[PDB]
Structures are given as structure tokens and as C-alpha cells.
């Protein structure tokens, strides 16, 4: 019902992401992804970044749904988030300060 998002001293930790399904568009610029968060630390801010393929210096991909934070009691399963990446391959990296993972996705590349 009520969702307050503050920036007070918090600890973002959610590198436990599992890709269950590829990113699919469900409308106009709306991609849906289903990854299971296997983290026994509870809810936490998932440090993830969405940028075009080969672009880690500028922001390009974005999460349509609220920030990538598993602030839930049942997010320990195949959760589902949204992303509005621009047409073209995109390099997304789901990792925190310590260990981090990086993956990419291509939907087309013809001329």
C-alpha cells in the first residue's frame, strides 16, 4: 500500500541474481525479465546497471520497475523486473562492489 524510498545510509547487496528467462518486450519499450534471487541475506538493493552492448561508460538501459531492490519477503524466488533498454544489443551487469556478474543480450543486428 505505502512505499517510501529514502536514501539514508543503506547497504545495497543482491548479487545473488539468477537469469530464469531472457528479456522480452511486452508493449512499447517495456521488457520483462525473470531472475531468481538466491540470497539468504533477506531484502537488499541489487546493484545492477543496464547499458547498451559495449557501453559501460554511459547510462543507456533502465529498469522500468522500481529500483532493482529486492525489498520483499518472497523475492527469494524467480522474481520479475522490467527494463526499457534502447533497440540494439545491451550489456547489463548484475553485481555489487565485491563479486559482480556481467551479461549481454542481442535481439537483432542486420543492416
Automatic annotation (TrEMBL):
**Function according to Swiss-Prot or TrEMBL:** Plays a role in virus budding by binding to the cell membrane and gathering the viral RNA into a nucleocapsid that forms the core of a mature virus particle. During virus entry, may induce genome penetration into the host cytoplasm after hemifusion induced by the surface proteins. Can migrate to the cell nucleus where it modulates host functions. Overcomes the anti-viral effects of host EXOC1 by sequestering and degrading the latter through the proteasome degradation pathway.
Which part of the complete sequence is present? 586 to 696 of 3432
Q: Name which cysteines form disulfide bonds.
A: 13-44
This one is known as Genome polyprotein
Outline the subunit composition: Homodimer; Homohexamer when secreted. Interacts with envelope protein E. NS1 interacts with NS4B. Interacts with host complement protein CFH; this interaction leads to the degradation of C3.
Protein's cellular compartments: Host cell surface; Host cytoplasm, Host perinuclear region; Host endoplasmic reticulum membrane; Host nucleus
